[PDB]
């Protein structure tokens, strides 16, 4: 297979364009001078995530490819936003499919899904990630951070903002290098040498809750807990898993390019065996997907679908396997928020493990027939693509060659898809691989009104972003382990458009100014996932030859339709069609 | 004018109006689809057609009783969208069918403000032709003329006088 | 030749010494514990550029060499100025000479040189630079940036400075992460989920123009277009090219160490064939130098020479090939501002392409006789080294400051050696420095005591000076879908003469505008526009040849004798052709 190296980065609270124009384009522009690169593709998403895939000529040494990529990325790192740099950028040389899933459940229902995920993140994932052959490890859930859930009513009552909160956290959750008594070079006759210990990271919600934000003129104290709820909770809330319908987390493990499948899996089990004796009570490992006695089901809903609606679809999938197929299926491990493609609120995946072969006699109880029957049962689910598969027609990129921009490229894409649909004798299921534009809330900050009021634009933008998007402030120590601190609005003050107006910013003169005084807003459409191909804006189109036609005939026709598109729109073949 | 959100033919109509599927729009209307079904942001099929430039769907919807002055959840109308996005023929059809030329959204913004800001001069002329208040002020006190000065658009300033 | 890794960096508005002392030295101090390294050299230039070259033993694996240099570089990266890190430090493993040049012209005359260079940078370069076997790509021109050309009279009129301009650009040309309505974790039952879109990068001169710098007490607005001209314009203006005397840009392409020339060249042409169909009208590729049928002409004037003077010499060169040699010469692609030396205002190069073998019968019309004749015709051009050659028993000598003597003493020692070597025509021909002479520089002293007494901050002084007279990369914007840079700088006419210094005002803490003349003094002095280092010490490279039928070994033996009489603390080493 051509080896591929993946760069991943994140920007908390960023929309797709923001990610693309501050991160993705910057990396791409700097991926020069790397040997044997066949092509590069990227997605920039409204989850705040970018993935850049660099695919190398067959025969390329994946180690050299990875090192060359990492080194260019290193020279580009100072060009990226500080918020992106501080999340950690990763570079992996991995297969894109899973080798295995390590599930973790709590048999005594002592621990919620969130607890279990933190336990895995904080106690298991690093040692697995260091096991030789392990290319990529996905946590099905999130590590805890310290979560400061801000209340805008209480902030405004005390004439405070998220900026004051972030400032206080950085000042009061600090790890200070303070020197030594009797330090070198010392005076003659010194008797005592001892470290000076000053501020140290906080370790608990109790300690965060008593951060001192201010002292009122009257002498009363405003503590962080007087304007926020303080709790441990995920760095993010996007991925939730279940094992046979019960709360779970786990690790999805991808094989390092060129490593040995069987050796790596055994190294993994051996590492798990070291951890088990120290689990808290109730906690237990399950094995829901070991790579013909397994398969996957993909769930892909339209952009716009929420966590609740993806979950309803996954509940249908899971139910089918635990009822209609309960004689063949041993388990289902289902993940809401991550799928084939990676991360989104509109996607899911179910890993299905079958009973022993010898106990599924009959060709109707073998994987091929089970997957076919499942796809057929799920083919009627509304506004979802749901199918079961183990783990070919064409792979086309439409390309913006002339700075046309997203809206025009979408119109060209639609023109091509309409033309393709008039040739059903030659092309079947010609479709975009990506996502459709969805409504977004465009808010305009009035620079004039802000200046007239003495309200700083940086205080406005921090207030907006930190409250509605979240902001990674600094690190703390949870039960001995370095983890993140995040500030964000408590959920109920960031749900609806009118909530924008309840957030106040402090002017230079000390007055509190509501957001409504200096902003206006409207609905518009934009992209939840912007694609690029060899550094240019792109839209991936999949399809296949119609029955009784060669792939090459299907491709020749696509090329002909492509030659009639608006000026500045090109194309290229990738993946299986390269 | 704030139409409530939810149904199966309504949803198909919202999607068809958005994608420009003229035939399907026609079929759905004949099968009783609510012409003013709204999505979660208050957009009706007329909003969608106007935003995305689908003239013939705009005409079909109005002929079947679409609320020409439908408001989204921030007070914006199909005329706002068509004026903002440069859809001249749509602007004319809407105003011809009783669109409120001086409708203000929640920010006090009118269709003339939007057309002015993007420099869509033929739209500006048509709106003024239909009675647009040339001196209407948004929440910040700004007129179309103030917009033309801030943007440095001399042609627009000329039209406004 | 042995494999070389090159580190390049850039510091806009920096003089040679600033580059050397804040970038070059800091990097060089980490270049040890690298396997198979023979030697290291560097140039730090008053163009704000550094290039360090690390040369490895024959047979060294260039991938490993590049990795090891880079790994040492990473130690210096956080110590480098932010202005340098943000330009993108490069580490390349290329041949030092060009494989080919791709030229670009517009046959309709509807694009300027500047427009063409932007098109090439924005639509063509990156794909070529990612092509396997491409070691280094040199743009002959500059990508557009958004140029804010400030007017100091208008700034002072509104009590503003370049610091206020830069601040406002950062605030109002911004790309804001603003979260979501209804995002996770939601209130359960939430149906609305939408990204919040707040400020986004500006895309046009119109949008930059309307940046709001301040609201007067009377309510009137000062916009950026009230204090600056705003246009698209090069990141820099130092490299200008022509093709048969018409406006052009291009890409000079060097081969990656060990890559196949035929295969790489073909992959380049396949990439260019993908681009061609999307060209705007009139744009066309030409091929002015394919590596014989070609040669180059180096043009090197003395330091101090302006763009206009280098252009005159380049015109004389181009004029010669298009008139005297018109039956042999198919094309000339001339570049003002870039030469064998690298980048500089006193340097240029011409790439010449000959007509087919079969339309030049006679030994007098073959490359060697053509270059010989050209070199002869150019030999009498005054104050310029101009020669023509395609692509031996010279020597390559490094005089080294081994005792902290400093630049001025090193130059005195160099001159001493050169004078001595001149009195030996019997063994040594044409002993000369490879570098540049010192030139006048404007030394300005900021009076700290006056600055403090007036309440004018040192950072504001330094930003006003540097941004106005040097240019400052503020942040990025999006031009027709592509991330590009934004620069602030004085409009040309306010940064041309010494007296202009005093028309720039800085705002004090109490709001008073203070001219630069109140807290500064200046004088003329000399300094170097190009500081050289060899194995991490200050150096001066000296070239020459063995006299007719003397061995290079005998010539070198003499230079070693002459070098042993120089002042204490001056040493030497052999590099390049002389190293083995």
From Swiss-Prot, chain A:
One of the protein's GO biological processes: response to antibiotic
Protein induction: Positively regulated by MarA, Rob and SoxS transcriptional regulators (at protein level).
Lineage: Bacteria, Pseudomonadati, Pseudomonadota, Gammaproteobacteria, Enterobacterales
A GO molecular-function annotation: alkane transmembrane transporter activity
The species this protein was found in: Escherichia coli (strain K12)
Protein name: Multidrug efflux pump subunit AcrB
Signal peptide: none
Entry's family note: Belongs to the resistance-nodulation-cell division (RND) (TC 2.A.6) family.
Mutant phenotype after disruption: Loss of susceptibility to contact-dependent growth inhibition (CDI); inhibiting cells still contact the target.
Known role: AcrA-AcrB-AcrZ-TolC is a drug efflux protein complex with broad substrate specificity that uses the proton motive force to export substrates.
Periplasmic side: 1-291, 292-578
Principal cellular location given in the protein's record: membrane
Localization terms from the record: Cell inner membrane
Gene designation per UniProt: acrB
Segment of the intact protein contained: 39 to 864 of 1049
Top-rank taxon, per record: Bacteria
Curated annotation (Swiss-Prot), chain C:
Signal peptide: none
GO molecular-function term, one example from the UniProt record: alkane transmembrane transporter activity
UniProt topological domain (Periplasmic) ranges: 1-291, 292-580
Keyword field contains Cell membrane: yes
Phenotype of null mutants: Loss of susceptibility to contact-dependent growth inhibition (CDI); inhibiting cells still contact the target.
Gene Ontology cellular component annotations, sorted alphabetically: efflux pump complex; membrane; periplasmic side of plasma membrane; plasma membrane
Up-regulation conditions: Positively regulated by MarA, Rob and SoxS transcriptional regulators (at protein level).
Membrane association type: Multi-pass membrane protein
This protein's UniProt keywords: Cell inner membrane, Cell membrane, Membrane, Transmembrane, Transmembrane helix, Transport
BP term (GO), one: response to toxic substance
Location in the cell: Cell inner membrane
Function noted in UniProt: AcrA-AcrB-AcrZ-TolC is a drug efflux protein complex with broad substrate specificity that uses the proton motive force to export substrates.
Subunit structure: Homotrimer, with large domains that extend into the periplasm, interacts with AcrA and TolC. AcrA may be required to stably link this protein and TolC. Interacts with AcrZ. Part of the AcrA-AcrB-AcrZ-TolC efflux pump.
Family to which the UniProt record says this protein belongs: Belongs to the resistance-nodulation-cell division (RND) (TC 2.A.6) family.
Listed name of the protein: Multidrug efflux pump subunit AcrB
Organism: Escherichia coli (strain K12)
Lineage start: Bacteria, Pseudomonadati, Pseudomonadota, Gammaproteobacteria, Enterobacterales
Gene from which this protein is expressed: acrB
